[PDB]
Amino acid sequence: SVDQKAISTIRLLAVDAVAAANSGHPGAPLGLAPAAHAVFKKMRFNPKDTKWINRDRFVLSNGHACALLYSMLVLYGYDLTVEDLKKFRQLGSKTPGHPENTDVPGAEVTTGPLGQGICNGVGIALAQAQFAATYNKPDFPISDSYTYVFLGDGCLMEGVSSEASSLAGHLQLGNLIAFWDDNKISIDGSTEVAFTEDVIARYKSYGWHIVEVSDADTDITAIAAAIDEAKKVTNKPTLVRLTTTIGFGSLAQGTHGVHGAPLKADDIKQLKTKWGFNPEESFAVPAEVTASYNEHVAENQKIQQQWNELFAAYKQKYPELGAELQRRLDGKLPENWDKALPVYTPADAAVATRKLSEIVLSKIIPEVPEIIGGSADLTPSNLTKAKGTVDFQPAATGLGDYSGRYIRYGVREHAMGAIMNGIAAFGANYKNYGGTFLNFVSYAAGAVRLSALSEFPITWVATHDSIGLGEDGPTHQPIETLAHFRATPNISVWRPADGNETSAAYKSAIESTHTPHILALTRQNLPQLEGSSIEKASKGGYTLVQQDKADIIIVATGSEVSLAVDALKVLEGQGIKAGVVSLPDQLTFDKQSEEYKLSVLPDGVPILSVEVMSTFGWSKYSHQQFGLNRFGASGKAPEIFKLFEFTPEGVAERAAKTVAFYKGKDVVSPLRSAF
Amino acid sequence: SVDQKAISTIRLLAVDAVAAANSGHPGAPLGLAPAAHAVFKKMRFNPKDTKWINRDRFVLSNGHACALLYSMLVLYGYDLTVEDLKKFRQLGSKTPGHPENTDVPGAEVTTGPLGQGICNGVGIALAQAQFAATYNKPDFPISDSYTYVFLGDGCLMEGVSSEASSLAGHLQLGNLIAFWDDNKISIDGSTEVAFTEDVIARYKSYGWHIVEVSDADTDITAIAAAIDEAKKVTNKPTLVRLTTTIGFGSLAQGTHGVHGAPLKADDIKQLKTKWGFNPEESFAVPAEVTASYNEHVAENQKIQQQWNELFAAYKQKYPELGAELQRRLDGKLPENWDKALPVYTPADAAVATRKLSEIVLSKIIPEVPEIIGGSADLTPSNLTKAKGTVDFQPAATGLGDYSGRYIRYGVREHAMGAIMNGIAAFGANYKNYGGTFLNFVSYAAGAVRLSALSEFPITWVATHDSIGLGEDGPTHQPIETLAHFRATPNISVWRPADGNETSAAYKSAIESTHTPHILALTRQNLPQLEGSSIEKASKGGYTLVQQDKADIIIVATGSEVSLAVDALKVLEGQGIKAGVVSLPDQLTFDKQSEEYKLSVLPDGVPILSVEVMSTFGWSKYSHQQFGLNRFGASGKAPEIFKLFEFTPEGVAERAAKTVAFYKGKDVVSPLRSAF
Numbered sequence A, B: 001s002v003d004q005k006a007i008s009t010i011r012l013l014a015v016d017a018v019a020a021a022n023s024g025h026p027g028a029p030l031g032l033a034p035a036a037h038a039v040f041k042k043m044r045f046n047p048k049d050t051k052w053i054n055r056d057r058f059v060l061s062n063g064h065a066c067a068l069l070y071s072m073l074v075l076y077g078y079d080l081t082v083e084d085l086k087k088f089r090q091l092g093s094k095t096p097g098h099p100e101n102t103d104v105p106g107a108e109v110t111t112g113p114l115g116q117g118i119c120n121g122v123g124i125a126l127a128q129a130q131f132a133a134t135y136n137k138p139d140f141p142i143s144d145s146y147t148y149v150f151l152g153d154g155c156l157m158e159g160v161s162s163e164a165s166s167l168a169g170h171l172q173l174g175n176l177i178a179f180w181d182d183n184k185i186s187i188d189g190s191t192e193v194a195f196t197e198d199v200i201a202r203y204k205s206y207g208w209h210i211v212e213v214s215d216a217d218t219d220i221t222a223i224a225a226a227i228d229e230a231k232k233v234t235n236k237p238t239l240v241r242l243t244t245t246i247g248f249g250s251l252a253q254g255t256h257g258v259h260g261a262p263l264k265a266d267d268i269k270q271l272k273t274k275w276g277f278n279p280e281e282s283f284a285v286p287a288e289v290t291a292s293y294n295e296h297v298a299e300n301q302k303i304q305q306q307w308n309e310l311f312a313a314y315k316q317k318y319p320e321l322g323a324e325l326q327r328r329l330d331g332k333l334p335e336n337w338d339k340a341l342p343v344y345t346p347a348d349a350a351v352a353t354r355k356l357s358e359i360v361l362s363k364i365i366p367e368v369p370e371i372i373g374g375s376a377d378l379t380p381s382n383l384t385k386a387k388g389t390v391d392f393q394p395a396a397t398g399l400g401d402y403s404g405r406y407i408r409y410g411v412r413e414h415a416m417g418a419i420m421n422g423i424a425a426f427g428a429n430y431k432n433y434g435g436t437f438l439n440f441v442s443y444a445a446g447a448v449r450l451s452a453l454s455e456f457p458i459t460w461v462a463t464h465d466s467i468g469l470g471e472d473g474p475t476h477q478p479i480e481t482l483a484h485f486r487a488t489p490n491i492s493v494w495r496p497a498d499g500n501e502t503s504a505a506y507k508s509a510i511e512s513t514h515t516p517h518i519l520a521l522t523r524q525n526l527p528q529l530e531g532s533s534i535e536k537a538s539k540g541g542y543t544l545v546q547q548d549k550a551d552i553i554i555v556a557t558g559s560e561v562s563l564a565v566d567a568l569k570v571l572e573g574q575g576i577k578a579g580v581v582s583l584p585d586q587l588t589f590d591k592q593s594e595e596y597k598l599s600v601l602p603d604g605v606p607i608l609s610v611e612v613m614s615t616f617g618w619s620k621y622s623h624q625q626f627g628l629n630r631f632g633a634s635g636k637a638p639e640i641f642k643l644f645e646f647t648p649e650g651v652a653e654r655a656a657k658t659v660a661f662y663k664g665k666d667v668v669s670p671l672r673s674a675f
């Protein structure tokens, strides 16, 4: 039949792509082609408009199987061709070895690191529910789309997927439909060696609905029926168990050897002949398959055409909501939204930057509807909920509503990170955030790195940033954390010193379209600085205290800027004139012009950095570094700072030693380099 | 009764400790005191010999509840006193705000980061099973101890605990007994807001046995009976559901407010009076409680005395095994074990360092019985299993035996990391390792940092270290990873360049007693270097190519050392004389004498670093840095190196620019500093 021919075409495109690269993963594509065919036939999408906001979304969580995804996208006429498939896994191609949303049209998210995609799917579904609750009206189903996720055994073993699946069940996300490739094989062989749990019983315990498809190698009727069944269960996410043979059709089907290496040439020949293809031909696309797939595309395009008319009618009936929705789909924030950002003067009281963050959120959440966010069980510590907002919960619980704006993630940092990526991936200008203690952002490193690679404007509200947290001690006190994330490409790591800098950090985080943000915030109170402003802090680094005859410049961040200012006073009593630079975000600073950067970190003067964390990275900006390269301590915070000599006198001593060390030496800016 | 008085004493010590610090967590200690009393009465331990190898182990996974643990240790006469409790959470005390195994006698592991302790308990239990299978004989139950773990809702939400619990169920670890503090409260309030899964059904799906104690606020008879029941189930780990009231007895019991802040003074008074204590007194220890606890200690000490006689008789009957066991309990490796390390010459073939690692393991596993390890579903890629070894599995599966040495962790990096910490914590000189791709060590950052803080000699076999892996692309290619772990205190991060350096890295990793190791290993082949040896590489950094008239020194690691040597040849054609330094472990190098380090990185010569990852950290050792500070690419590895100019010519160009940049400048070693 044409459906059978389509499945064979998908299988053989994937195998031929792996063969041409002599690299990649044929097994799961062979096993999942029937399901992919069935799911894409149920999905609404436009290959010519990948951003249609009411499309169904597909996520390949088992991203190594991407030859399957690329084959689907090619067959459906996305901006990806057979010539691109021939360049699978080749430098510079549109068909990289794992899917990248920045590079591959129709890849919603970046997968490959196992467990992430299913969590991203939870976030897409969460966003869809919130979006629909915000905009839909009687006779106006602006948003009614589904989220389809493929995942394998590896994703089910990764703890991040358990976190997200527990939360998705709690949140009753009935438009999420996930499909487990139950093939009983991973890299180490049979799942009997390491993965013998009753997966189905576990998913029932989370509150998911289950459909089992015992013969998913062939039974596309049952796969389609499973989707129909899942759509009837509106208050539970559904897991469809697809019992498949890895590498179905290969001589090596059902073995670990078919997971991750190209098939033998003779194996590919026998696949082709028994499915009615020419064993001498590669990359075959039967025109009847193209015709069948084009019929579905044409129907989907008529659905989108009707949606556009629905949206036009919505703007007539609901002019305010319609204009808001249009602005969001255009990727634009509200005009002058940033006038809501709080501004401080040096006469204002000292405030912890976690509390300054609460105040910012309180002012901007009512002004910017596309802001939603939550905390990983640290709401009263991170200060991430604006008073007067409701939680995102299914109304059936009585605890919130899907129109709510505040997410109770529970103690689930990694899934929070990956869910945030999915919310961003949904689109509609969502600017979403997640709170935890800075030291436990590290639990979510897998997802954070993907925020950076995927270019998603997510925000971590990362409080309790240092030894300044005090008594909880070294298991809670960051040392390496900022260095880790600053060393990752494309992460803005803001460590604001005061009220104006905290507003600048949020301005950056909310305006972002391609760069994730981490806001490192204090437990403890900090003074409002003389010389700070949103304008200057928006440059990422700026001269706080200018000293034209400086013997030294002290560059600092966060809580250490006030320390530097106090050290300047001690140094004056010692006959040493210092300037102070505040460097609230190294990435933003780096992106400024060379002339601007040199105005902050000039030639001809020694520069000392001060930050109560690792010294890694700081030589970009300084000649000498005063940091903390050992673990912390459990005690009252001021006593810890004294122990480690992060005091005005301790900074002054090191500044005086720095001046002495460069006496008689020629000093050029740390910004200079040989290449 | 005396038991009731003991429970009250525990509760009030914990509350008084929090009160004195005006900081910490009274709620879970109040709720868990009955269970703690009951469990410690069942446990075999010697407060005067915390390292008795056949002790039962206790782990407080909900480490914020540590005032409870400290109270137990004080009451039982560990090397921790009431005067230490009065210094809870104070700088320098033996009672830090979360338990630290390095500082607290009777703390087996370091907890506080949620989810870790239960996984550590899985590792202690895994080690006990392996140890017993190795040494026990008829009439000689050398090892028969249990592992008791307390955990809360937060631990159950963290994905790492799901990973470890799935694996523990698979491994049929019947000597593991965990207790869930089912109090329905976390920081954000009721668990109804975020954690509504059926925990018990989930644990049944993993293959755990369940006992439910409905009234764990009072029913110590039922808690004791639950332990007895768990001990009868020898082929399943057991979860005991302790239904408790958080803060039991407080005016604020059953609320989130009692989780994490000191009680009000009037609340403490009413607690005391209704439990028969003096409300004017703090830190009371009724002598009848001390007497009762001392009786149990005395009985346990007689059990250990008998165990010592059993061990003496074992050495008579099984002289070889007995001597091996004695050596392990003394903390000593086999005499001359390192003679098994492979040695290479420059005439030997090129080999990938992952394959060199396989060869090392093949030689040393038969020589050092305390080496065990595994991989997170990457055994045929990491090359972590020695041929001829058997997997650690319950014999009932037919897939291995508890005497086995190779662990199939599944796709569970984070739990693997925390399980490794538990295996190390068991003691008996275990030197254990875990394989994954370097980029996915980051999934386990929570546990890795705790390896460093806990001073455990665990080893990550972290292959596929760079863009050298090729086609899998940027989701798999480390950039920030080495900088992250090098910036963490107390992590040795070895990146060996060749066969001799790989043997040095293993010598360090296996000899370690207080420092975790990460071995960053290649997919791709590397040549054997002229000038390498185990002896020189053991210094962490060494001069590979000495050039007395050097215009520049190139410092490199791993795959980039051979690149530097090839660049030296290009530079000679340009009239530039270079030396080469290999820096296989920065931490080991840093620990060498100042004179040794200056002999490697002298004054008076520009130094360029080359490593195909982040430049962070490298200014410790170099004036200029050639690294990769952007994400990678999917393609054949040699083409990626060419794209980024990590070629002999590209390195030479940057070296020549470095020489030019320092013309007419005075250059001192990067090792010099002002303070």
Ligand SMILES: CC1=C(CCOP(=O)(O)OP(=O)(O)O)SCN1Cc1cnc(C)nc1N
Binding pocket: A027, A028, A062, A064, A112, A113, A114, A115, A152, A153, A154, A155, A158, A181, A183, A185, A186, A187, A246, A259, B376, B377, B378, B411, B440, B443
């Ligand atoms: C183990 C591993 C794989 C097996 C999956 O096993 P599976 O899901 O059951 O896939 P399959 O049925 O065999 O096609 S892929 C890649 N990899 C390394 C890998 C490890 N860890 C992380 C976080 N991401 C990865 N990418």
Ligand SMILES: CC1=C(CCOP(=O)(O)OP(=O)(O)O)SCN1Cc1cnc(C)nc1N
Binding pocket: A376, A377, A378, A411, A440, A443, B027, B028, B062, B064, B112, B113, B114, B115, B152, B153, B154, B155, B158, B181, B183, B185, B186, B187, B246, B259
């Ligand atoms: C959320 C959080 C806590 C609530 C636990 O909730 P729980 O386990 O149910 O504890 P409880 O019954 O209330 O005493 S403690 C500390 N903390 C921050 C915290 C967050 N993430 C990690 C990895 N470790 C932590 N330490």
Ligand SMILES: [Ca+2]
Binding pocket: A152, A153, A154, A181, A183, A184, A185, A186
């Ligand atoms: Ca599988």
Ligand SMILES: [Ca+2]
Binding pocket: B152, B153, B154, B181, B183, B184, B185, B186
């Ligand atoms: Ca709880």
